[model samples]
Target: SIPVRGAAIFNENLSKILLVQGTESDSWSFPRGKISKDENDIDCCIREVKEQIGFDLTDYIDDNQFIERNIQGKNYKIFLISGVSEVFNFKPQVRNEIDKIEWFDFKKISKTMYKSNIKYYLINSMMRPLSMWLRHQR
Candidate 1:
């Protein structure tokens, strides 16, 4: 697998957080992926989301970080990106990879997240959450 990053999209109107069920859609996980060859971390994070999730972000504010195991048994950097929604719309463009989009409350997000360790990391950084990727579903 590759290093991945994701965002806890916050919506003030509904007081809810936007999260994805992933196309191959399984347990709750954020959008994330490995850094490309010699790419800047922020750029790598942006490209992954646009290519995978189909959402284009006009800005990126650093939120937080975490680490996880890779398929090759290497550790990779996971960056949290803070982004504003251009609109309320979220559509998963690639079915083979990502197929679901959803919004969950902050508390629900913490409870439902099956990736315990990752969730904990997110919880610790809740004050300023950020980061993401395309169907970077893995």
Candidate 2:
């Protein structure tokens, strides 16, 4: 069975979402990691974000404020750090799990090396309907 993972991310305003590229991988993605034993998805989101970025977001996330689903047979649960209403102007801390962190406009995400679901979810869940496929959902 594919193990579960959680992604903790937030928009950096102007329809841009933050993404990080791990030192171990070339693909860009939101901060995410595997779920540990006896750990729930939300806790894993907090753990991964803290472990990757050295920022403690545990206080910002409420249990009810999350979206969970299966992507490519992997259990991927996404939590938006909605409490951060504005972008963090300072650069993020560099950590072993991630070496590069940057924000990308939603429309340009498809050109990056991020996993497909990251782009799919961000646009579908948060961005304004800019594509014909998303327009059909209305």
Candidate 3:
């Protein structure tokens, strides 16, 4: 079964994105994890945020569709979404899998992430249109 992994949280109004520093890999990525057997994608997205970072993102669920990725022959789905609050406001918990949680701007994408594929995905999936739209609105 192509299971629903989790979601990548993003703030549409701000150019900021939330990234979790992996406790093992030490790489940066959007806060994500495995979904339970009974959980749906949206429910998992909300539940994961609470479990991983101590933030409840139930209200900030954006209208955008889930971004799907093919990872080593597995079909993983993630929601790259628009959040309601600013990055610094939330107090992320230091969980077993995640040591630290931080926000990164669009400019830091290439320089910060250890995963090249993730960087590429951020650039093409979120940064391109999000940055362009924000610029025009100015």
Candidate 4:
């Protein structure tokens, strides 16, 4: 069984997400890594985001926003987690595989993401201004 790999979405003001190019592929996704032995899912998300993106998250981290997908090989899963960082610092792990870090409006990647399902979860996170719906309140 292949361990689980996950992603984190840092949605900022102006409807853009902070994304990092995967060290393994040309595609871009939120910072992510495998769920280590004896680690919880939430903790895995926290660690991966910090290790890969060079940021820290805490109790203030929002759990109301998140999404998950299966990788489809063996018993693996991919989580496209969405939330605001507890801290705004950005010092990506330079020695890591991530090449270019960037901010992209959700629309720009609708055609290039691993799948569109994560986009749906992102839209519902209240990170963007949808013309027909009211914004979410904390």
Candidate 5:
């Protein structure tokens, strides 16, 4: 239940969100990981995303724009970064840690597509905030 930080990277139109699947797991989630001691949230998020998907988010991250939730016992915060090109190729830097990286239409995700033990309700609740944020965008 360590504090988790990551990026909710979305394509330019906000129609697609990037997700990663671990080598040993079938479920997919945003690129995120536990924060190491003394690392700030944005740094941890950027580092994790880079390690997991080989995508550097240093310039794309907005420290002030993110969503957080206390799911189960862990705190999760995901920075909202939009306008990424959908066609950009993604590679995993952490060998054997990640196996797949794909863009999923946020509006089309369902419970069956997530980890079986994950709290689907909590995931949807997290998405709701992003949905609200998207609605206000130009």
Candidate 6:
């Protein structure tokens, strides 16, 4: 599969991470998509975030700040974005692709509730990076 890119958007306090659920399934994951032939990694990340969550992250993305991991044979890259206001209204911009949006407390996520592909990313990819980031914020 093509490498995937997206944003792991966090609220102002860095306590919650935004996740999107598709209209056709119950699985919750980050706002992300596969890269197009003409799109760079950052642009792909920004575009997918906007399309899935109705949030534009053009100014918030940093090329150097991201987590990269290979999960179940697919390469995935997610940029870490913090300090987004919790009050920002969230809706699915692409009605067919996304149906629900919610913030998951990264520190308190349950494995059974998120046992999809995202579960792998959360446990295998995001946990350590998020922990290290939080440690530095103290």
Which residue pairs of candidate 6 clash? none
lDDT of 1 by residue, 1-138 (tens): 444544444454434555555544354555555667787666666666665567754365353443333335644444433334536566655556666656655555546556554333333334322222322322
* Among all candidates shown, the one with the greatest TM-score: 5
Q: Report the poorest 10 consecutive residues by lDDT, candidate 5.
A: 113-122
**Residue 105 alpha-carbon offset, candidate 1, angstroms:** 0.7
| Model 2 lDDT on a 0 to 1 scale | 0.57
Q: Write the per-residue lDDT of candidate 2 for residues 24-119, one digit (tens) a residue.
A: 766666676787777887788777776666566777776765556666776666665533434464244544566776766645664543545542
Please identify which of the two predictions, 1 or 3, would achieve the higher lDDT against the true structure.
3
**Who is ahead in TM-score, 2 or 5?**
5
Which pairs clash inside model 2? none
Give a tens-digit lDDT track for model 6, residues 29-90: 78899988888999999988888888999988889888888887888888888888888998
Candidate numbers, best lDDT first, in rank order: 5, 6, 3, 2, 4, 1
On TM-score, the stronger of 4 and 6 is 6
Candidate 4 residue lDDT tens string, 1-138: 545544445364425566777656666666666777888766776777777777666543444444444444533233333356425667666575776666667555544444553333223332233211113422
Candidate 5: residue 123 lDDT (0-100): 48
Cα distance off (Å), candidate 2, residue 65: 3.4
Q: Please give the TM-score that candidate 5 achieves against the real structure.
A: 0.86
Q: Write down the lDDT of every candidate, Cα atoms only.
A: 0.49, 0.57, 0.61, 0.53, 0.82, 0.79
TM-score of each: 0.58, 0.62, 0.69, 0.62, 0.86, 0.85
Q: Could you tell me how far off, in angstroms, the CA of residue 5 lies in candidate 5 after the best superposition?
A: 0.4
Pairs that collide, model 4: none
Q: Is candidate 3 or candidate 4 better by TM-score?
A: 3
How would you encode candidate 3's per-residue C-alpha lDDT over 35-61 as one tens digit per residue? 677877778777777777788777766
